[PDB]
């Protein structure tokens, strides 16, 4: 096919061994309780014990459970060494890796300030990027950097590109587009191949897209609000990259891929305050209203109907033969979308699995799901991809494995 | 032309009356001096007098002068009517209550000033009003609206909130963020991509992409650091808000508009220069550093970059350059001169870029769009313009345009 772009070669990197969810819940409850006491000047022991009991009860009530997420990669969760009489014993790290310690449960419960967290994000994402691109043999024409969890100029992506001596590669930042960030990056990539075909640049044969989300860098243990307990137990870290080729180049290379058939994205009414993020003195501060599932449920089916129509497909006739890659924004989101679209389990199985084994890795989640489809599905399989994030924004893509 | 995109309809909005450079230098030196004393708990008068004398000397040596930049729009600098003076010190009157979020510095208590979240909340307010002014004449929603900034990152953004306020629920919004002073270039690049992606059929047909730049550099005032490159930054940058549209050429003709047709685009990093221009969000503002080496590094790479850029548009640098205008981002007081000299250009080929700088200062990513607006108004039809911008990376960005 001429005028066709194709996703391929998804490469994730794990930077830290995932932590079993029940351990994350025990230590996070403990930290929240310590922080609450520091923030409120509670220094007596019985007082701690009372607060700690209340805190555990709230986690038991609201936290994402180990039945919902089995484990999470949390680069900035304490090392199992060293987690140590009714408390936990968190060893100071060796000055040699102080940059992994951003929380403080002893002195200042606000923990590291935003500059310090950004310096750490650059060092951690820098190493993650070198690993993701270690098997890259030739520079891309473009490299797109997706993140909503650390904003530096120049970025760790620009520094990697310069480190590889790739002085003919355009670097574009695709930033602050939250959980759905893969969708604008693939649209920009499809746009770069199409701009080249129009002649505004010389020809191009590959765009790489690198996501580096360190949501654990934004831990906030000083705020006990329910939505913060939920976020602290829901989100996880994820680093993954993939390429977008013009289909003739994909073929010349003998590669299998997911051909882009259509894209869509826009805002949903009466929703802007329901999912927010603002940089503060210490971290990117997030809010996440419990109204969000209902608003997603309200608009998903119409959005999917239109998305299929843009692909030359018809929802009524074609949706039974489709897979649906659905971003698992919260524990029930895939189920809500599944119910509203009338989907069978086998249509949404990979999305549920990625969530269960990894938690919500922000924009890196849909790429992990697409990675699984590309590695498991038969050629000919068509996939409708749906994601939702701040705006609220609905984003969609229709793909066909080739 | 088929497969052709075209810039048009540049609309700036001025939010605050520009302040003459000399009073900004005086008040800013005073703020730096008061902040050094506050930071250090120095309360002695003579002690303050001595620091202030030292600070003024550093500004006389290093600050961008009124000969280099006549005035700047600075939303976060007080209006001249609120300044009190007389004894060599300054005081600032209380702002009108609905304008209190305009006060993000503190020279009486805690010289770090407003924290980063408070600054983002003020930026949301100012930019929200700016956007409403910028899009007040818009008669039909665009297919896409690209928000450009490097001076305030919120989710959802003021641009997405505007789009929802207007009921524009078929408009895709894309954030084109953290690409610094050259940020019009990736934005124009994404707009072109969106029109070409539509032609490929991955979306329905599109007729207009709007790009809205909102740069409030003055929200990032940092009077607590007296290092030289911060004296330069505090006196060089300025605020700028401006929107423009990218049309497929057939639509632009249907509308009867003049525009700048896009012929070619290029962008890539310069070697060994990542640490020469940096920004990092901290507790109170985006902290910037700017190396004195930037001009030499740009100068040493700009010719090969321009030759390649012209080649991408079908042109030959040595044969064709005398006929082109060159829009050059004025990143610092000597940048256009340096580029001008390396490329062997005549004053008249770079005059608008120097005038924009002299009249406005460096409005970050908004500066190139103001230059292009002037070429669109003033240039003869058929004039071709090579546009060059620099920013962190370092990154060199190029665009070749033709007025139609
Ligand atoms: Na760039
Ligand atoms: Na968006």
Is residue B334 less than 8 Å (CB to CB) from chain A? Answer: no
Question: Which among A300, A292, A281, A269 has a CA at the least distance from the CA of A387?
Answer: A300
Token readout for B59 is 């500004």
Contact criterion met (CB below 8 Å) for B30 and B90: yes
Token readout for B42 is 């120095």
DSSP state of A109: T
Q: What share of chain A is helix, strand, coil (3-state, %, to 5)?
A: 45, 20, 35
Cα of A157 from ligand 1 centre, angstroms: 10
Give dist(CA A70, CA B289) in Å, integer.
43
Nearest CA-CA distance, residue B180 and chain A, Å:
8
Instruction: Tell me if A5 and B202 make a contact (CB, 8 A cut-off).
Output: yes
What approach was used to elucidate this structure?
A: X-ray
CA-based angle A385:A183:B207, to the nearest 5?
110
Cα of B179 from ligand 1 centre, angstroms: 6
| Strand pairing category for A238-246 and A207-213 | antiparallel
Q: Is the alpha carbon torsion for B220, B224, B230, B231 positive or negative?
A: positive
CA-based angle A165:A170:A171, to the nearest 5?
90
Instruction: Tell me if B190 and A188 make a contact (CB, 8 A cut-off).
Output: yes
Structural domain for A397, as ranges: 1-402
Contact criterion met (CB below 8 Å) for A243 and A205: no
Output the CA torsion A362→A366→A372→A373 (10° steps). Answer: 170
At how many degrees (to 10) do helices B158-165 and B116-134 cross?
40
Which ligand sits nearest to residue B389's alpha carbon?
A: 1
Name the domain count of chain A: 1
User: Which stretches of A63-181 are DSSP H helices?
Assistant: 114-132, 156-163
Contacts of B391 in chain A (CB under 8 A): 153
Question: Which among A69, A72, A94, A75 has a CA at the least distance from the CA of A150?
Answer: A75
B86: left (phi over 0), alpha (psi -120 to 50) or beta: left
Give dist(CA B31, CA B394) in Å, integer.
31
Is residue A374 less than 8 Å (CB to CB) from chain B? Answer: no
Burial class (CB within 10 angstroms; exposed 0-12, middle 13-18, buried 19+) of B351: middle
Contact criterion met (CB below 8 Å) for A381 and A323: yes
Question: Which among B151, B297, B290, B280 has a CA at the least distance from the CA of B232?
Answer: B290
Token readout for B290 is 């700017």
| Strand pairing category for B384-391 and B325-328 | parallel
Give dist(CA A177, CA A185) in Å, integer.
9
Contacts of B272 in chain A (CB under 8 A): 162
CATH number at residue B73: 3.40.47.10
Q: What are phi and psi of A385, to 5 degrees?
A: -115, 130
Token readout for A331 is 């524990």
Contacts of B156 in chain A (CB under 8 A): 272, 275-276, 390-393
How many CB atoms are closer than 10 A to CB B134? 22
Cα of B190 from ligand 2 centre, angstroms: 13
Instruction: Tell me if A175 and B175 make a contact (CB, 8 A cut-off).
Output: yes
Interface of B with A in 180-209 (CB under 8 A): 180, 186, 189-190, 192-194, 196-197, 199-204
Which ligand sits nearest to residue B268's alpha carbon?
A: 1
Contact criterion met (CB below 8 Å) for A207 and A185: no
Residues of B39-58 as b/e, b for ≥16 C-beta within 10 angstroms?
eeeeeeeeebeebbeebbeb
Give dist(CA B105, CA B397) in Å, integer.
34
Helix (H) or strand (E) holding B402: strand B395-403
């Amino acid at each position: 096919h001429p005028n066709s772009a194709v996703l391929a070669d998804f490469i994730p990197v794990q930077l830290a061994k995932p932590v079993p969810q029940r351990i994350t819940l025990e230590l996070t409850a403990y930290g929240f309780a310590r922080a609450h006491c520091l923030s409120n000047g509670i220094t007596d022991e019985e007082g701690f014990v009372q607060v700690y009991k209340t805190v555990k009860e709230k986690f038991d009530k609201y936290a994402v459970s180990p039945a919902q997420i089995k484990q999470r990669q949390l680069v900035y969760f304490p090392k199992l060494t060293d987690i140590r009489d009714g408390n936990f014993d968190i060893a100071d790290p060796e000055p040699d890796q102080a940059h992994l310690r951003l929380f403080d449960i002893k002195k200042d419960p606000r923990g590291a300030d935003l500059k310090t967290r950004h310096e750490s994000y650059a060092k951690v994402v820098g190493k993650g990027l070198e690993q993701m691109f270690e098997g890259t043999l030739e520079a891309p024409d473009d490299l797109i950097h997706v993140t909503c969890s650390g904003y530096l100029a120049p970025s760790p992506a620009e520094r990697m590109v310069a480190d590889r001596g790739w002085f003919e590669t355009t670097v574009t930042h695709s930033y602050n587009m939250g959980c759905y960030g893969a969708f604008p990056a693939i649209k920009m990539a499809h746009g770069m191949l199409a701009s080249a075909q129009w002649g505004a640049t010389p020809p191009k044969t590959r765009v790489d897209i690198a996501h580096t989300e360190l949501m654990s860098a934004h831990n906030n243990i000083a705020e006990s609000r329910v939505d913060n307990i939920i976020s602290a137990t829901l989100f996880s870290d994820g680093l993954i990259k993939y390429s977008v080729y013009p289909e003739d180049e994909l073929r010349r290379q003998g590669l299998r891929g997911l051909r882009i058939l259509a894209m869509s994205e826009h805002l949903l009414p009466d929703s802007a305050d329901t999912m927010t993020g603002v940089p503060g003195s210490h971290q990117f501060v997030m809010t996440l209203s419990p109204l969000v599932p209902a608003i997603i449920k309200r608009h998903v089916r119409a959005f999917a109907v239109d998305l299929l129509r843009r692909a030359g497909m018809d929802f009524e006739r074609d949706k039974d033969a489709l897979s649906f890659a659905i971003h698992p924004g919260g524990p029930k989101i895939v189920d809500h979308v599944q119910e509203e679209l009338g989907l069978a389990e086998d249509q949404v199985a990979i999305s549920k699995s990625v969530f269960l084994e990894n938690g919500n890795m922000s924009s890196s989640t849909i790429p992990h799901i697409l990675k699984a489809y590309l590695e498991e599905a038969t050629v000919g399989t068509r996939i409708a991809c749906l994601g939702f994030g701040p705006g609220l924004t609905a984003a969609g893509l229709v793909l066909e494995k080739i």
